[PDB]
Every structure is written in C-alpha cells, then in structure tokens.
C-alpha cells in the first residue's frame, strides 16, 4: 500500500490477533503478551462499512418492457432496442469494474494508513525514551513491566517519569 507499513516495514500479520484489526505484542521482564487497539480498529471498520452502505443499495427507478419474448417485435425497432441495451450493458460493466477496482485500492491504502497512524502515535508518546527498530518495533531502554505497557495502550504513558533513566541507558 501507499503508506508502506502493511506488507511494508512490518513483515507480516498476526493470525493470533483475533481480538481486532491492529494491536500490540510486548516483550519485557515478565514475558510476552498481546492485545488489540480498539480505536484504530474502529476507524478502519467504520470507514469500510461506510463504503458498503453507500454501495449496497438499489435504485427506486422502474423500467418496463420495450420488447417481447413470446412475440418478437418488428425487426428494425428490435435491432435498435438490442443495440441500445447492449450499449448500456457495456457502460455498466465498465462502471462496476472501475468502481470495485478503485474502491479496493483505497480500501487497502486506507487500512495501511491506519496502521501507520497507530505506529506514529506511539512513537510520539515515547519520545526520546525509545528507538525505532525498523520492523515495526520500539526497543525500550527503561523497564516497562506489564503495568507500564498497559499505560502505553491506554494513551497514559508519562514519558517524563522514565526520561532520565532511558536517556542514560542510550
């Protein structure tokens, strides 16, 4: 995608993440654990379902018979009708093909974008108390226990508390 995270600087997805779309998997002095980011998940879900409600609707526009299956209409007028209908089929087959293709492009880029938005939020939270690994990972110098990690996920991590510690541990 356009934002280079999904199928980009993140190697792959997590089949274990059944909890949501995007999430965290930490490592610390207590072991490994994983969880889901509700907010980023929701934006993506909501935007995608917004596409659907918009597309999954039929028009209230009635069309009637202008030819006849049991009793063929005069050939001349019949050929004009067929040509007109076929012309209209060509327009709609084109439209549907372009619609779905361009929707899918945006969908995929949009989901990539949201992952990037989540990554960048966290980076900004940690400040100079962490570093960019490059695989979609933040190496933390100070000791983040499970309590610490949960503060990050909840947008409450206070960087000033651990600043001195992690700046020294460079």
């Amino acid at each position: 995608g356009l934002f280079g995270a999904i199928a980009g600087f993140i190697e792959n997805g997590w089949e274990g993440l059944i909890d949501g779309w995007y999430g965290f998997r930490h490592q610390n002095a207590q072991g490994e654990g994983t969880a889901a980011d509700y907010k980023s998940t929701q934006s993506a879900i909501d935007q995608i379902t917004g596409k659907l409600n918009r597309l999954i609707e039929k028009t209230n526009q009635q069309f009637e018979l202008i030819d006849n299956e049991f009793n063929e209409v005069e050939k001349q007028i019949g050929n004009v009708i067929n040509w007109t209908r076929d012309s209209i089929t060509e327009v709609w087959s084109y439209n549907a093909e372009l619609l779905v293709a361009m929707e899918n492009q945006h969908t995929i880029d949009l989901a990539d974008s949201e992952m990037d938005k989540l990554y960048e939020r966290v980076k900004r939270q940690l400040r100079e108390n962490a570093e960019e690994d490059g695989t979609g990972c933040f190496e933390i110098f100070h000791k983040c226990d499970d309590d610490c990690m949960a503060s990050i996920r909840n947008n409450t991590y206070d960087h000033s508390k651990y600043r001195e510690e992690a700046m020294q541990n460079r």
């Binding site: 997805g13 089949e15 949501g20 999430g23 039929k58 028009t59 209908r85 293709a101 995929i108």
Partner: protein, 316 residues
Amino acid sequence: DKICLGHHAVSNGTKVNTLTERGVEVVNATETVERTNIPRICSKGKRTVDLGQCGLLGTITGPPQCDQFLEFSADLIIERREGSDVCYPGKFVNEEALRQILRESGGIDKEAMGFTYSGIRTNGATSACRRSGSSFYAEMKWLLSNTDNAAFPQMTKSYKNTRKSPALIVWGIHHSVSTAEQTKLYGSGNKLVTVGSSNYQQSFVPSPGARPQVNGLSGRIDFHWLMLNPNDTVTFSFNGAFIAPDRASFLRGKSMGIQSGVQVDANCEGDCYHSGGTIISNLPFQNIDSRAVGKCPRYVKQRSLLLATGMKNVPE
C-alpha cells in the same frame, strides 16, 4: 525490553482486483454482482392478475378464455406463453404498443358505447369462439346485411368520450375466405370503412381471399385501435366488413406487466422480475438477465466482482 506493532492476518484470504493488480489477497471481501435467482414470481402484497390462457389484448375484445378478465384490476400483470388474444383467427394492428399501454394500465373498466342499428343483423357468431355452442367476442358485435347478398347500407355512428380520461376504442375488419363469401355477408361492391378523431385519420378497405386454416378456419379479422381523448368524438363510416365495438375501455391507474413461465408466490416479495422469476437483492449489479424489469440492480456481463472489506492479507 520492547513493544511491537502489528495487524491481523488469516490463513484463508479472498483474492480481489485493484487499479494496479489482479488477484491481491485481502482479509475479507463481499460480492457486488447478484447471481441468486428465485424461480417464482414474488407477488406478496401486490394485486396480481395471471392471465394464463387469456391474451392481454383479448381482455379488450373478449374471446371466451378472457371472460373472467374483461374488467380486471392490478398492480402486477403476468402474460403466459399459452395465452391467446383471439378466438376467431386474426390479429391487432400496432399490437405491441397496445400491450405496453395495457401492461401499465392498472387494469381496465368497461363502458357501453351506445351504438344501435337498423336494416342489418348484429349477432354474428362462429365455431371458433365457444360458449355453449357458437358465440363471438364478448365486447364486439359482428355486423352483417339482414339477408344473403343484401346491400349493406352505408352507415354513420359516433361516440363522444364524456369521461375525464382517454377512451380505448377497438374495432375489427373481417376478411372473408373469398370474394363470393364477402358479398354473401355484406353485399357486392367495394366496401369502405373510415375513422376520424382529432389527431387520427385512417381508412380500411377489406381483402377477401384464402388464408391457411387456423382453428380449422381460413378467415381473418383485423383488429384496430385508437385512444379517444376526453370530450373528443369518433365516427365510423362503413359499407360493410366491419366488427363493431359494443364497449369502450378506460385505464384504471398504474401497474407493471411481465412475461414469465413460473409460479406466483405470495410468501415472497420482490420488485425485479424476469421470465425465470424474481431477483431479490440489495447488490448494485446482477448477472442473471439483461431484460429484467421493475426496480433492479444494473445488469453486467461479469459473473463476479469482489469488493474488499478488509486489509491486505500478509500471513507467516
């Protein structure tokens, strides 16, 4: 020591198409083209008239198979292959235009024209039109000359549409099996029928001769029609060969008409119909029948167009 960001993935993903790429795999997807047909006519909540053996145009003239359809009412009108518009062999001029008017008429209501006659017979019948022995078209009258070879006196008859909607007028022309058999019924000489409304002028001369035996009969009747506006008058000048309207039709409102070979189903609701049944769907497109009518998804040639509803699948 660390905290890593990621996203979800599946073993089974769905391939879709984009601007840039054919068959990129995504987490989840959904169909945009309908292929599921319901093989019934879904009529729930709709005043429905299945014409069966009655032809739509026969509702105006009234051969016996249309006797229970002379004044129908409907939101939905269904024509069947077994239907027939005639008992005595013949057909309509501008047949399809008339059908179209009738498909969306909402049904019909009939009213006596008020023609009376003198110096001629009014009760002509045949073995093709069966109602306890020989009969004719219920809404018409087969006009003759009192006795054989007798001069059919040049006649003038008018009818003013006094109602607030246009009248549908229908009259026939009888082409006998020979030049002789024409003079028998209506007397010799060149017969002439003419018709004149405010926006309609036409004339009709007969044409006796030998047609193939349909229903065992080689005669034909040419049915013709016009829409007579409110307050407008229509006059019939005729020397013979004329099948006279007894009643005029008026259109009740709105309806739709379809052609089909499947059963009606009142448990089922739908607004998009075709000869094989009903397309029930909210999908924007369909690949079932390009001649589907009513309120429908747009027809497209593709069987399938999957729309991504998830991110790209990037598994282990």
